[PDB]
Design a protein around this ligand. Structure first.
Ligand SMILES: [Fe+3]
Ligand SMILES: [Fe+3]
Ligand SMILES: [Fe+3]
Ligand SMILES: [Fe+3]
Lengths: 206, 206, 206, 206
């Protein structure tokens, strides 16, 4: 035999321009629409304040964005195709049943805003597209799903083989879309800029 | 931006001939020694029968194999170097402190023997070298550590990108050594041959 | 001292007489039936041999036991109601959408048979009903979902107090049903009784 | 009905008055001290700003609080004994080898401060002592180690019954110590009181 060391059980991170598919979205219309919706949403504004929610999110107040706003139906038609390419990369056996949009929402993170580590319970693919970035810094940090199984293990060198690293930081530009499997833990670092960081996040189910 | 999909958080499986390092072991002496030890070990033989242990294991009866048997000290001197190469691949930050042998034991799996899925609690590297194989079939199956986080996810196609597969089966030859991180779940498929499958398994701590 | 130690995030295991729900089911007939169907099932017997599976499962060979065998349709009427009571205990938000049977199979574990550690991927509630239990005969043995998080911890003394143990064994009587959440790992230790341990296992999805 | 639902594999959370162990420690002096050390700690203040950390931790800047500040040496004498009582409850096999302090740090969380979800990698017992708690002020909130195993399950109604919840909030009083196993995920929700929430957090290893 020959000595071999093999990579197994790898997580895949998908990172593309939104414009890789689906109809075109105007970035100016895109940002302005996010703002116009958030400003008309008294109920979501109050829930954020009561719940101690760092930014604005539309998640508790608005459940039907693509029904109500052509630009959001347009967005979901791109996202649909991005999720299809990704389900393909991930080798999902879908039968006759594509992944479909379960939830979709706006975030507006002002300066000083942060979102603590979490997963999206009961979804298959989750993701975020970036509507306005600030335009440093990292906007997403993904944590190794095996981290809590690694308690007895030495910490790892922060070396140049990215597949061995324990956290992965992502620094998207406006227009980019990120996708991942929903069980993956992820955090959103503090907005250090004075301008808002606007993004749209979403869950796809099977 | 360019569309990219990246592999993250990968498990590494190390698979080498034992003879890749350390002093040479005679395979005939190696097998015969395993047998001679197991046959003199009344206490381990009785514990196996009482505990409903599929084969013979020396694990409960003999804690000091390398102290008692030059061939086992020889083996540990090879294994020491195999574990060093692997800790290097895994990018462990070890300070001034190499991984050292914690436990080491013989298994003799007769026809019809199987070992159910398990991990090795409280170790860093675990592994097995193969002393006598039978010489079909698969002797080790490794399970994706993320399997139980994948309950809502479609099953995956059994395709040709091994890093996306949910189980990995390993079919070693005599003389091979396998190593993995101890939190990784692994099972030993039934010995379908009539001859015993003899192996030596071990845990390294930090 | 005002020191309090609270228990949180406990895994629930449901245990009831089968007869508390559903049509009357005679245990002597029930045993007789499982033996009878397993005898005719050459496919099953052969897949078992081929796949190195100890004893005897119908899981690969036969797929609609409830529709074919009236006594399995009665069993399933009972399971539904047991499952519903468990979901009530858990207390899942079900809409008006009751969990339904997804698979059900017969196991016959002879003297010396073991069934290795495993979960039931992609199910919500999993469970077993006990058909013939020699003359003890092997427990179902449950494993702590947290075990792989525990690698840095010291070992726990079988401080029993069956709350602080890594595994939990159950010796059910004939006629009992056990249910658990499908992510919960479990095995069947070696049947050391001369007679067969017969059981029927199943999964429920939403 | 003879139906039983048993609780297994429960996570333990220890809660006691700090004063039940160790030298006397005055809470007014204790508060005064934490404020005082945090004020001098420009390094800490600056790392915080730089690293987008809300409020104020000493964890990056100061590394031997017990040796430098007598009141922290007294605190630690107390923690040792609290930890030992918890290890006794757990009941780890410790040899004659008591778990010892590995790190300890001051947190000061102002109005609007949050501390994101996280574990304490590579520790055995982790915990917090409460120093100034406005005028409620944020709970410590604990997350079910099993959450990522639960992706196929329905959502659970805040059926409280603080046994079946995915998170568990604690509102401790000034002078309380809380301890948990270091793999347990937890966060601090937004401090909504105008005044600072001061606490001291620590890890113990074997
Ligand atoms: Fe998220
Ligand atoms: Fe093993
Ligand atoms: Fe099972
Ligand atoms: Fe903490």
């Amino acid at each position: 035999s020959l000595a071999q060391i093999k990579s197994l059980f790898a997580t895949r991170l998908y990172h593309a321009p939104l414009s890789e598919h689906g109809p075109a979205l105007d970035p100016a219309e895109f940002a302005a629409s996010c703002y116009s919706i958030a400003e008309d949403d008294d109920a979501g504004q109050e829930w954020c304040e009561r719940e101690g929610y760092p930014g604005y999110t539309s998640y508790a107040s608005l459940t039907d964005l693509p029904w109500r706003f052509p630009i959001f139906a347009d967005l979901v038609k791109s996202l649909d195709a991005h999720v299809a390419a990704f389900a393909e990369d991930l080798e999902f056996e879908l039968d006759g049943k594509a992944l479909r949009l379960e939830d979709i929402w706006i975030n507006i993170l002002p300066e000083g805003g942060v979102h603590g580590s979490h997963i999206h319970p009961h979804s298959v693919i989750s993701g975020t597209t970036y509507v306005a970035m600030p335009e440093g810094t990292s906007a997403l940090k993904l944590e190794d799903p095996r981290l809590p199984f690694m308690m007895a293990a030495p910490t790892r060198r922060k070396g140049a083989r990215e597949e061995l690293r324990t956290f992965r930081s992502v620094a998207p530009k406006v227009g980019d879309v990120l996708l991942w499997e929903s069980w993956l833990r992820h955090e959103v670092p503090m907005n250090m800029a004075e301008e808002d960081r606007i993004s749209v996040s979403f869950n796809y189910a099977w």
